[PDB]
Amino acid sequence: SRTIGIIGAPFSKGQPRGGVEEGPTVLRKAGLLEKLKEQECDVKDYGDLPFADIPNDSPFQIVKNPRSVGKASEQLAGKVAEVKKNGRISLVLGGDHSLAIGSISGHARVHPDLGVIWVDAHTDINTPLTTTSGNLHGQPVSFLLKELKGKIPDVPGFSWVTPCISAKDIVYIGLRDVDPGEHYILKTLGIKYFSMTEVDRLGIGKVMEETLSYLLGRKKRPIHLSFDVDGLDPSFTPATGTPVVGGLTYREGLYITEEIYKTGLLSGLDIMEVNPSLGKTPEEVTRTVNTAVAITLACFGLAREGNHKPIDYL
Amino acid sequence: SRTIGIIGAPFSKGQPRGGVEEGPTVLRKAGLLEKLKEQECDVKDYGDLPFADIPNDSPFQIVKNPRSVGKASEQLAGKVAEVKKNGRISLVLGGDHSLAIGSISGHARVHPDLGVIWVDAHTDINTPLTTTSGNLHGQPVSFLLKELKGKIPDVPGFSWVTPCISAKDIVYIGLRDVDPGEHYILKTLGIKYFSMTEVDRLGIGKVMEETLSYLLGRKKRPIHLSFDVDGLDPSFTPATGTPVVGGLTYREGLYITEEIYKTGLLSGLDIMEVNPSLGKTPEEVTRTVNTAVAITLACFGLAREGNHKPIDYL
Amino acid sequence: SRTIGIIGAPFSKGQPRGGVEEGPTVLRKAGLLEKLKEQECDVKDYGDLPFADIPNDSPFQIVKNPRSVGKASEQLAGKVAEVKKNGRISLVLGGDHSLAIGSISGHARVHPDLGVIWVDAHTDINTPLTTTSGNLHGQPVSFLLKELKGKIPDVPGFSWVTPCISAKDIVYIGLRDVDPGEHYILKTLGIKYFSMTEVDRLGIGKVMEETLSYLLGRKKRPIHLSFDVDGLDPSFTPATGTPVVGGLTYREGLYITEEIYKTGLLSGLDIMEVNPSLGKTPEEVTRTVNTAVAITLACFGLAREGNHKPIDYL
Numbered sequence: 006s007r008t009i010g011i012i013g014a015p016f017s018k019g020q021p022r023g024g025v026e027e028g029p030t031v032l033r034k035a036g037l038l039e040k041l042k043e044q045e046c047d048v049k050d051y052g053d054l055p056f057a058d059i060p061n062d063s064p065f066q067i068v069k070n071p072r073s074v075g076k077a078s079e080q081l082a083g084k085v086a087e088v089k090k091n092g093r094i095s096l097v098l099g100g101d102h103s104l105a106i107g108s109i110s111g112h113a114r115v116h117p118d119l120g121v122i123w124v125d126a127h128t129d130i131n132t133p134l135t136t137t138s139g140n141l142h143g144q145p146v147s148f149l150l151k152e153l154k155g156k157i158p159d160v161p162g163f164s165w166v167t168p169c170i171s172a173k174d175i176v177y178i179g180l181r182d183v184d185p186g187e188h189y190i191l192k193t194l195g196i197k198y199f200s201m202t203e204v205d206r207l208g209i210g211k212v213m214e215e216t217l218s219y220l221l222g223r224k225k226r227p228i229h230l231s232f233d234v235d236g237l238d239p240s241f242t243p244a245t246g247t248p249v250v251g252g253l254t255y256r257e258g259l260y261i262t263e264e265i266y267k268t269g270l271l272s273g274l275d276i277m278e279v280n281p282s283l284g285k286t287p288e289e290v291t292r293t294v295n296t297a298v299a300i301t302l303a304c305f306g307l308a309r310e311g312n313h314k315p316i317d318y319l
Numbered sequence: 320s321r322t323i324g325i326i327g328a329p330f331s332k333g334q335p336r337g338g339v340e341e342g343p344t345v346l347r348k349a350g351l352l353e354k355l356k357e358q359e360c361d362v363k364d365y366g367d368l369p370f371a372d373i374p375n376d377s378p379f380q381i382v383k384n385p386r387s388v389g390k391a392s393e394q395l396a397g398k399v400a401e402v403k404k405n406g407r408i409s410l411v412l413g414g415d416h417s418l419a420i421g422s423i424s425g426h427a428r429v430h431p432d433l434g435v436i437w438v439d440a441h442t443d444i445n446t447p448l449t450t451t452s453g454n455l456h457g458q459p460v461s462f463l464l465k466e467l468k469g470k471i472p473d474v475p476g477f478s479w480v481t482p483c484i485s486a487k488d489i490v491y492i493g494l495r496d497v498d499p500g501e502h503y504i505l506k507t508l509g510i511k512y513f514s515m516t517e518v519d520r521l522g523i524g525k526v527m528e529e530t531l532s533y534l535l536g537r538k539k540r541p542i543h544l545s546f547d548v549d550g551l552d553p554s555f556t557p558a559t560g561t562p563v564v565g566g567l568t569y570r571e572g573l574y575i576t577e578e579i580y581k582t583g584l585l586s587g588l589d590i591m592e593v594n595p596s597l598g599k600t601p602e603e604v605t606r607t608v609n610t611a612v613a614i615t616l617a618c619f620g621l622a623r624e625g626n627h628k629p630i631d632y633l
Numbered sequence: 634s635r636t637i638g639i640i641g642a643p644f645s646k647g648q649p650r651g652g653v654e655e656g657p658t659v660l661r662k663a664g665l666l667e668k669l670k671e672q673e674c675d676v677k678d679y680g681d682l683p684f685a686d687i688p689n690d691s692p693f694q695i696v697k698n699p700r701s702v703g704k705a706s707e708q709l710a711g712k713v714a715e716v717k718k719n720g721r722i723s724l725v726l727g728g729d730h731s732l733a734i735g736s737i738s739g740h741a742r743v744h745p746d747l748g749v750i751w752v753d754a755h756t757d758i759n760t761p762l763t764t765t766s767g768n769l770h771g772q773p774v775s776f777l778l779k780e781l782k783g784k785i786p787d788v789p790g791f792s793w794v795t796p797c798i799s800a801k802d803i804v805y806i807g808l809r810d811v812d813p814g815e816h817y818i819l820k821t822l823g824i825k826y827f828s829m830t831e832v833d834r835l836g837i838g839k840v841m842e843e844t845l846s847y848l849l850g851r852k853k854r855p856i857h858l859s860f861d862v863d864g865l866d867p868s869f870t871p872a873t874g875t876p877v878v879g880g881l882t883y884r885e886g887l888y889i890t891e892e893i894y895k896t897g898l899l900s901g902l903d904i905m906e907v908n909p910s911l912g913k914t915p916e917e918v919t920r921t922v923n924t925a926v927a928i929t930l931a932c933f934g935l936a937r938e939g940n941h942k943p944i945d946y947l
């Protein structure tokens with residue numbers, strides 16, 4: 006049995022729009038913890054992390070809010086590793102995607118052999134030097150990869166970081182808005198990816214088979230799934246900062262997570278970029294939070310074919 | 320050539336919302352019979368069944384409107400078998416899904432070797448004892464299966480029933496909202512199913528190939544298709560009682576029926592759960608009835624690649 | 634490197650609704666030429682063709698505006714062949730689909746071995762004799778096919794025409810609204826097609842593999858892609874004359890064009906039937922023009938996985 010540790014990460018400074026810091030509140034109020042308990046699940050809430058304001062935080066070159074972003078990830082890393090040490094699956098509710106730096110980092114402290122599956126419209130792999138936006142939620146993978154050590158300058162707020170994953174340890178699913186520099190890195194390091202082009206080519210069934218085979222063929226290992234909700238089409242998750250049309254369907258989102266759940270190796274989870282303030286209507290907000298919740302429940306056992314307890318129902 | 324017998328079943332007491340009893344009217348007014356005649360088809364309307372009110376109908380334990388539901392199915396069974404005896408494909412317009420008890424029962428009187436394909440978001444396989452809702456449109460399969468004889472109590476209105484199909488004789492397509500007890504039965508009896516998980520895994524092309532192979536591999540036999548319109552995503556069929564997101568597409572709905580039509584073994588058809596009263600707008604109603612009509616026309620020969628008469632057009 | 638020649642064809646008389654003549658303006662104002670230059674592309678605008686009014690143009694039997702349609706295609710053919718002779722990929726912005734007669738004709742003057750891929754909800758293969766609508770945008774393929782020489786009467790405005798393609802040289806993708814006579818021709822001449830039925834059966838990945846194999850297996854040859862925007866579902870391209878539900882997705886549209894681009898044999902392109910006047914709202918217009926632009930950019934190299942210049946980004 007899956008045991009769970011819920012971590013709230015109400016943080017927005019990895020990008021411009023503020024509303025994403027509310028993601029944990031709105032997911033919680035949607036009944037997340039309750040529905041989890043409704044299923045197989047033993048849930049422990051570690052609360053929402055308290056991130057002190059860092060009011061003196063001028064850009065580093067063009068990188069924005071570097072100390073605030075870096076400290077928020079540091080604090081998160083500590084709480085993830087703690088949850089992992091407590092033998093629980095970590096569930097991080099964001100919060101912008103810059104927090105993956107901390108989530109993946111703390112996870113890797115307890116499980117250095119983790120493999121990452123990254124569900125997203127973006128590769129989030131810009132370095133502080135290749136970024137044009139300066140937004141750190143567009144940079145988390147660059148900091149985590151060993152191969153890029155040599156390419157990440159010393160950014161204030163980030164000296165605690167030590168890249169914990171190799172290019173071989175991550176698979177992207179969903180890409181459809183990749184910066185040229187990101188694409189250069191992607192191709193140079195030979196990272197496994199399934200852009201929407203591949204999903205279209207192969208079908209989500211084969212995508213997940215290749216993804217799981219690629220990460221677990223050699224050896225079973227813990228899986229960290231970093232789910233940016235903008236990975237799904239904005240018709241399912243509109244309330245988000247950087248939506249891109251041509252996204253994954255609701256069905257595909259549920260199939261990805263259904264398949265991961267079934268490995269029995271889900272070890273860390275991030276549910277990121279829900280910005281309720283960005284819904285053009287109250288129904289767009291509910292649709293977004295509802296989808297986010299459903300993705301999460303699938304990650305912990307809720308299957309479309311149904312579920313039952315080990316009793317005789319007749 | 321396909322010959323057709325249309326049966327109206329304006330009945331709602333298998334579930335709480337009343338508007339589904341209008342389904343036959345709105346489908347008819349959408350031009351159903353006319354469009355059928357527009358294609359290959361010889362159509363005979365047997366009219367809308369007249370279901371006397373049964374005003375004394377208190378719950379049986381928690382099962383609601385049992386006599387009304389049971390009598391409505393009894394009457395329907397008689398009219399189906401009659402249509403079948405007239406050598407026609409039976410086309411039942413519902414009406415809530417509890418009527419499948421009668422539709423499948425009467426069909427099986429003339430063709431005891433029928434195989435059932437059930438298109439639906441639900442398994443509709445609760446027994447009177449496993450149901451939590453007490454709604455009979457959630458129970459029709461339990462009554463029909465031989466394997467569950469021993470598990471169905473004596474419910475008033477249902478003593479005429481004799482289970483006519485085995486677990487091996489039905490394939491479900493579309494499942495995404497299955498009760499635990501239903502899932503227990505599903506797994507215990509080893510019923511062939513393709514939940515939305517399987518459709519996602521395999522693609523609808525392989526789903527229909529396995530479905531038709533599984534039912535007809537051994538021997539050709541008549542096919543009964545029980546189509547709950549909530550099997551399709553509510554973006555195509557919103558005007559319905561129990562909608563569930565992540566449904567089959569319009570395209571998939573048409574591919575399922577296109578493929579069935581092409582077997583030349585369609586023998587019975589149910590078009591169920593259209594509730595025009597449940598459309599939030601008049602366009603949602605039209606979209607629902609339009610989809611329902613299109614599914615039906617495909618079932619009787621209308622193909623997306625086109626159709627032509629056996630003449631030289633040039 | 635792809636070099637491009639843009640040809641505006643503001644013409645509507647192949648069908649009843651006038652607004653399609655604006656397609657070139659609205660596509661241009663959406664930044665088409667600029668975004669092309671933003672990518673690999675050397676762009677030359679040949680301007681919008683000026684089509685003199687032909688005010689005396691009574692039906693030929695039931696065929697409408699025959700001289701106007703025929704002259705507009707004649708003029709277009711001249712400008713395509715000119716662009717082709719300048720060693721550029723021709724990009725025709727329509728304009729109704731009747732213009733394909735000229736686009737394909739002029740293209741074939743410089744490249745008689747062209748193969749055609751036709752993305753559309755319709756086969757547009759009615760002859761002047763099989764048509765029931767009399768609308769010429771429903772007839773362009775009949776005029777182009779050698780096999781139908783003998784079946785096309787002498788229609789005023791069309792004596793300059795000489796059928797340049799054989800039945801073997803065209804593949805249709807998307808069909809879902811085919812007239813009986815069209816279906817007769819389709820089946821009689823043995824034309825390669827993937828209706829929505831095939832796309833559903835096979836998945837777009839296999840559709841494009843079979844399409845490209847079928848056209849290029851024997852020999853590499855230039856490709857002409859005639860893209861009717863009604864080929865995509867009206868949820869992506871609503872602002873159009875003859876929309877049909879159950880269309881290709883946005884994703885499929887981009888996968889088709891991504892795959893064609895990658896052959897490096899795209900030689901001619903038509904982007905047809907955008908009617909901004911037919912959007913029920915200003916957002917429906919933008920959605921339509923946006924989709925049209927995106928399809929086009931994919932045709933000239935813009936890939937979902939990303940793109941980068943041949944430099945070292947790190």
Ligand SMILES: N[C@@](CCCO)(CCCC[B-](O)(O)O)C(=O)O
Nearest residue numbers: 102127131137138140142143247
């Ligand atoms: N790549 C972007 C856009 C670049 C524009 O030139 C977007 C990053 C999105 C971050 B996410 O967490 O949402 O995926 C960036 O800001 O780095």
Ligand SMILES: N[C@@](CCCO)(CCCC[B-](O)(O)O)C(=O)O
Nearest residue numbers: 416441445451452454456457561
């Ligand atoms: N399984 C349901 C819900 C159970 C809630 O605990 C739904 C049945 C739907 C019947 B249908 O004909 O629409 O598929 C039931 O009422 O039995």
Ligand SMILES: N[C@@](CCCO)(CCCC[B-](O)(O)O)C(=O)O
Nearest residue numbers: 730755759765766768770771875
């Ligand atoms: N086949 C149609 C409808 C026939 C009705 O009987 C439609 C032609 C559409 C032309 B398009 O360029 O849009 O695909 C025709 O006008 O020929």
Ligand SMILES: [Mn+2]
Nearest residue numbers: 126127233235
């Ligand atoms: Mn993203």
Ligand SMILES: [Mn+2]
Nearest residue numbers: 102125129233
């Ligand atoms: Mn992201």
Ligand SMILES: [Mn+2]
Nearest residue numbers: 440441547549
């Ligand atoms: Mn149902």
Ligand SMILES: [Mn+2]
Nearest residue numbers: 416439443547
């Ligand atoms: Mn049902």
Ligand SMILES: [Mn+2]
Nearest residue numbers: 754755861863
């Ligand atoms: Mn068309």
Ligand SMILES: [Mn+2]
Nearest residue numbers: 730753757861
């Ligand atoms: Mn067309």
